[PDB]
Structure formats: C-alpha cells, structure tokens
Design a binder for this molecule. Structure first.
Ligand SMILES: C[S@@+](CC[C@H](N)C(=O)[O-])C[C@H]1O[C@@H](n2cnc3c(N)ncnc32)[C@H](O)[C@@H]1O
Ligand SMILES: C[S@@+](CC[C@H](N)C(=O)[O-])C[C@H]1O[C@@H](n2cnc3c(N)ncnc32)[C@H](O)[C@@H]1O
Ligand code: NA
Ligand code: NA
Lengths: 238, 228
C-alpha cells in the first residue's frame, strides 16, 4: 500500500503499479509535452511520445473509481491524439479546456503565434462530480445587460437575483514552469469534494499536492526528481 | 464547365469533382459539425459523421496547389479527429485556432459551459503563404525586465481569437484568414458556402472564389449579394 499525502521519488510506471485500482477520485496530470524542454521531454519521434503517453494513461485509468474524473494537459496538437485515444478507451469526454496564456511569447512568422495549452477533461461515467457553484467566475459587462432585461420578470411574485458569486465557468481560461495555483484550484474544486483522493504522477513543483492539501483533499503522487520531491515535501510540511 | 466567381447550387461531392485539381490556393471550410442543427447536420453516429467528413476532405486536398492552405471549422472534439486525419494524409499542421466566442449563454451544470469553436489550419507544404504583417492586432511595456514601446503596427496575431457575432461566420474572422493565407488574385474555395461569407469577403479582398451549397435559397441570395 502506497503512503498517501507525501510525494514519492519514483518513476511514474513504478508509482502507478503501487496504486490501488479504483481508488482515485480525480487525476490531474501535467506530463511531458514533447517540446524538448528537458531530457524527460525529449522523444525520438511522435509515435514514441504517443506510446509512452498511452502507457501511463492506461494505468491512470485503472486507478480511477467508477465515476472518477481526469484532466490531462498538453499542446493542442498532442491533445488531438490523446483525446481520440481516451474516447477509444471508453472514457467520456466532458470538455476541451483552452488555457489562453496571453503571455508575451510564441511569436512566429510562418503561422499564428503559439502559447495556448489544452487541458482535456474526461470522466469514467456520466455520474461524475461537477461542483459548478464552486468555480463561478465574475460577471462581465454583458451579463449585467442580460440581468437588466430580466430584472422586471418576477419569479414566484418577487424580484429574482442572479447568483452573487458570478457566472458559470466556461472552457477558455485566462489567469493572472509550474502551473498557476488558481488554475489547479479550479480543477480540484470543480471535480472533487473534500476528502477525495487526487493523483498526480508527474508532480514537478508539487502544485497538485499543495492545492489538494489547502482544499482538504488527500493526494497521491510522485516525481522522478529527488530535488523536486524533497523541495515539494518541505513546502507541504509548513 | 464550372464557372469561377459564382456560388453553385450543387452537392459538395459533385461540385468538388468539377473543380480542377491543384487549382486552389486557400480553402476555408465551415462544414457540418454534427450538432443536429438541421437535417444536413444530423448523422446517425460519430463514425458516420467522420466518414462523410473525410470524404469531402480527401477531395478538397486534391484541389489545393502544392503550397496551398486549409482552414476547417468544427467543434474542438471533432477537430481532434479531423486533425489526426489530416496528419495521416500528409498535411502539415500549422495551428489549432481557438475561437473564444465570449458568448454569455452558459447553462451547463455537468461540465464547463460550451461555445468555443476550433479552426484547424494546415498547409500542403512548408512553403505556404503566411502574410503575418497583414493581420497584426492591438496590444512602457514590461518584457524580460525591460520597458518597451509597442510596435506601432500592432503585435503578431496569436491563436486564440475574439470576434463578436445557420449562424454566418463573422466577416472580420474570415477576413483575417483570407489576408493571412492568400494573396490578391489567388483562388479561395468553400464547398459549404451557406450565406456566402467566404465568397463575399474573398471578393471584397480581390481574391477569386468558387464554391457551392445544396440549398437553392442560400445560393440565390448569396449570388444576389455578390452581384450587387
Ligand atoms: C511538466 S512537469 C510537472 C509540473 C507540475 N504540474 C507543476 O506545477 O510543477 C513534468 C514532471 O515530470 C517529471 N518526470 C518526467 N518523466 C517522468 C517519469 N517517467 N516518471 C516520473 N516523473 C517523471 C519531471 O521530473 C517533471 O518534474
Ligand atoms: C455551417 S453552414 C455554412 C455557413 C457559412 N460559413 C456562412 O458563413 O454562412 C454548412 C452549409 O452546408 C450546406 N450543406 C450541408 N451538407 C451539404 C452537402 N452534402 N453538399 C453541399 N452543401 C451541403 C448547408 O446547406 C449549409 O448552408
Ligand atoms: Na462529445
Ligand atoms: Na506539430
């Protein structure tokens, strides 16, 4: 039995083989993207990259319980292949999330400038957890116009007030190496509940564990890098 | 003989077989999305929708010249499959364009609210036309620890696009595509013309066009607008 709530210094396949099947409620995975940003992100070909990816995906799917949720980050191009692969495995597509980075980067002169990233969101069944009221976003200028057209329409004889926490979150996200904590927070608030178990087999700086712990979720995870693991476990403990 | 610069009332498969191979520089295609918005947009299965889609794609690819470009709109989910199909046909991926509609109309309570649309942009070779200076957009400025003045012509356009509002595509969006990926006098193809947006913008930009739609009312009205 693998110790929960501590990041382990393990290869993802070794780690995954130690995880109990059907024990995980949410898996949030930011894996290699094949962009050659490091030795672990360099592959000989696109097929080798996909074979590696599909191998870890298969194991992660065995870990999810019957209604579990899955989020996988990658470039849009790699997500096209991963999306079709997940459909072929029986997973249920929920959303193609677009992270609009709006950074200063991506400049190109043979094509539009890059930088967006994709998050695929699938679930094991149609009875997954989706806490929509916990991830609402601030109302726009245009939501307020709609609010004005409905203000005079009474409900049950009285004025109706729209939710004070904002509008339902959509699929194109914009925020203020590690993923932004607010981004991972939206994922964990929407697709898990307090005390559920969250898995991340490429922990990196430990963002998934850190945010899971702050939100009262349990986590299980690993990274092959000793320095990253020790540094993240230290952050978790204070 | 197939008339150039006219929208034809034809089925897309018959129309494409009349178009000469290797004659087109840019194809801008907004096809069925399988969202059941009409009889032509309703398929019995996803597999049937993909078989139909690959059939018209194969013919479109034959119409592009050796360095031609292709834009195909669809939902993100269907573009995942179309993207992989285009890669298997030897086309070169350039961008996964995200159209963020900023549509205030959310009501999903089982997943995030929908509305985004994707435009896949591929080329036949690495020597395609890409007029990056014709599609710059609006942004001293902090960048890398330094302070800079913006390029006065605007910044290079990226891949997540915001353009307000069958539902005809926004003329400004289609204009960005035709300015980026074609030149004056090139030929633009669209085999699912609908209201005629691709033809109208192409004509306003000094490009030639050819296209079709099976709907007689759409073709006549579009041809009306083009003639005026
Ligand atoms: C893109 S990063 C994760 C970043 C993380 N989301 C965070 O916010 O910092 C992927 C991580 O995968 C780890 N890694 C790469 N290949 C691995 C493998 N086969 N097994 C385990 N860890 C691996 C790397 O050491 C790196 O820290
Ligand atoms: C999404 S709409 C095109 C909208 C267009 N981009 C516009 O801006 O108005 C798809 C169009 O496909 C046409 N259509 C559907 N199936 C067709 C087929 N097999 N052959 C030809 N036209 C077809 C429909 O009549 C409809 O006008
Ligand atoms: Na779907
Ligand atoms: Na690529």
């Amino acid at each position: 039995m693998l110790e929960i709530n501590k990041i382990h210094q393990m290869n993802c396949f070794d780690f995954l083989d130690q995880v109990e099947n059907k024990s995980v409620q949410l898996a949030v995975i930011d894996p290699p993207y094949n962009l050659s940003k490091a030795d672990w992100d360099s592959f000989d070909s696109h097929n080798e990259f996909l074979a590696f990816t599909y191998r870890w995906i298969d194991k992660v799917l065995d870990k999810l319980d019957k209604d579990g949720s899955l989020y996988i980050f990658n470039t849009p191009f790699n997500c096209a292949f991963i999306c079709q692969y997940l459909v072929s495995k029986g997973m249920i597509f929920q959303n193609w999330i677009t992270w609009d980075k709006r950074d200063g980067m991506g400049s190109a002169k043979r094509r539009f400038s890059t930088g967006q990233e994709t998050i695929l969101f699938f679930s094991k069944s149609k009875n997954h957890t989706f806490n929509y009221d916990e991830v609402r976003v601030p109302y726009e200028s245009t939501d307020r116009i709609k609010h004005a057209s409905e203000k005079g329409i009474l409900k049950n004889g009285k004025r109706w007030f729209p939710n004070p926490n904002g509008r339902l979150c959509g699929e194109v996200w914009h925020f203020s190496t590690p993923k932004p904590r607010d981004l991972i927070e939206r994922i964990i608030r929407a697709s898990s509940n307090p005390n559920d178990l969250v898995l991340d087999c490429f922990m990196g700086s430990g963002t998934t564990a850190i945010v899971a712990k702050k939100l009262g979720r349990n986590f299980i995870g690993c990274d092959m890098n000793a320095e990253y693991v020790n540094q993240a476990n230290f952050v978790l403990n204070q």
